[PDB]
Amino acid sequence: CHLSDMLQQLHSVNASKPSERGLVRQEEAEDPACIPIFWVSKWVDYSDKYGLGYQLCDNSVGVLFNDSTRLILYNDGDSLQYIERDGTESYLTVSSHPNSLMKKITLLKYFRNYMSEHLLKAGANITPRRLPYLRTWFRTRSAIILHLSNGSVQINFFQDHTKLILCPLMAAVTYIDEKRDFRTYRLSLLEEYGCCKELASRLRYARTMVDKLLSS
């Protein structure tokens, strides 16, 4: 649904060959109303044994466990959301001490603590405009692809620390460049005004990744 929408929006921008305008006028495509509310600021791949832990930009943490269940810890440090393999959601607190979930809670706290001490925040200096969980993820040789339950797809490129945050609702893309500057564009407006070569090649790659998400 949202992925198929994202796929058309990307194809449409890419088919416009936006980096080949006489003069590119990217800035005209910026739309502050489209700035994403959530993105992944930190992640830890422990998929060999436990799963994938992550931090969202609000400092909440989540884990997609290998058993395909999900656990989210809100930034109050006590409130939890647990999502079953079947997708059923429920809310509870660490301090309630639920025997059945103590292992998963302890794993999540490990992830939170490790990210806190040993990783830096992506998008730490970003002007703000339902908290999502991680629906699926995968890695390629050059990027990690993160698909959130709100429809957003985030792609983090390894070689140069550049990132894209795509929203299919807003039909928008946020680009985090090598200098850590952030900008949010309306995709339809990049078609009209053009964009630089580096955003253009990344949006081509983004399309390939959205294809991958759809075939999987």
Side-chain angles (χ1 to χ4, degrees), residues 16-84 87-124 126-140 142-158 160-178 181-196 198-213:
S16 86
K17 294 193 198 165
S19 70
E20 320 227 58
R21 302 279 171 284
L23 162 72
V24 352
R25 296 208 294 140
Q26 218 164 353
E27 61 281 345
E28 304 289 343
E30 296 186 34
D31 190 351
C34 291
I35 295 160
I37 300 149
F38 298 102
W39 62 89
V40 179
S41 44
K42 299 182 186 183
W43 59 272
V44 175
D45 181 358
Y46 213 155
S47 61
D48 29 314
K49 201 171 197 313
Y50 298 120
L52 190 293
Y54 60 89
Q55 178 201 61
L56 298 186
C57 56
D58 75 329
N59 305 317
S60 62
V61 291
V63 187
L64 167 61
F65 295 105
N66 282 359
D67 72 4
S68 197
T69 58
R70 302 153 173 108
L71 186 70
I72 295 150
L73 176 69
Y74 295 82
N75 74 3
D76 72 0
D78 196 31
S79 310
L80 298 161
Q81 191 194 324
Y82 185 58
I83 301 142
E84 290 284 7
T88 315
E89 301 156 293
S90 55
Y91 297 69
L92 66 148
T93 60
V94 177
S95 56
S96 67
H97 203 279
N99 283 173
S100 55
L101 278 181
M102 287 315 289
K103 186 184 230 79
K104 288 180 182 176
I105 284 162
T106 301
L107 285 167
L108 179 159
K109 302 279 259 268
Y110 163 83
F111 279 126
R112 185 196 57 188
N113 294 350
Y114 176 87
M115 296 186 284
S116 174
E117 277 309 294
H118 302 298
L119 308 176
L120 308 162
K121 253 203 146 190
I126 291 197
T127 309
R129 187 194 294 177
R130 179 101 45 170
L131 195 151
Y133 57 82
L134 181 60
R135 193 157 279 161
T136 199
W137 65 279
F138 66 86
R139 289 176 72 150
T140 65
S142 83
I144 185 166
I145 290 72
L146 301 153
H147 177 26
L148 301 179
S149 60
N150 64 0
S152 288
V153 171
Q154 182 172 330
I155 305 162
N156 292 2
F157 293 93
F158 302 134
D160 64 353
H161 309 267
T162 60
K163 310 175 175 60
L164 298 173
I165 305 155
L166 290 153
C167 180
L169 301 165
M170 294 302 200
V173 66
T174 298
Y175 182 44
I176 301 167
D177 64 27
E178 297 98 332
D181 211 2
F182 54 102
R183 253 100 162 111
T184 304
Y185 305 103
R186 216 84 135 121
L187 295 169
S188 63
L189 293 185
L190 293 176
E191 296 177 18
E192 185 176 355
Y193 298 113
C195 76
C196 60
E198 46 190 292
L199 180 54
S201 63
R202 281 163 183 76
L203 288 169
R204 287 196 273 106
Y205 192 87
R207 189 272 172 71
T208 307
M209 299 304 100
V210 173
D211 277 323
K212 275 159 136 275
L213 284 169

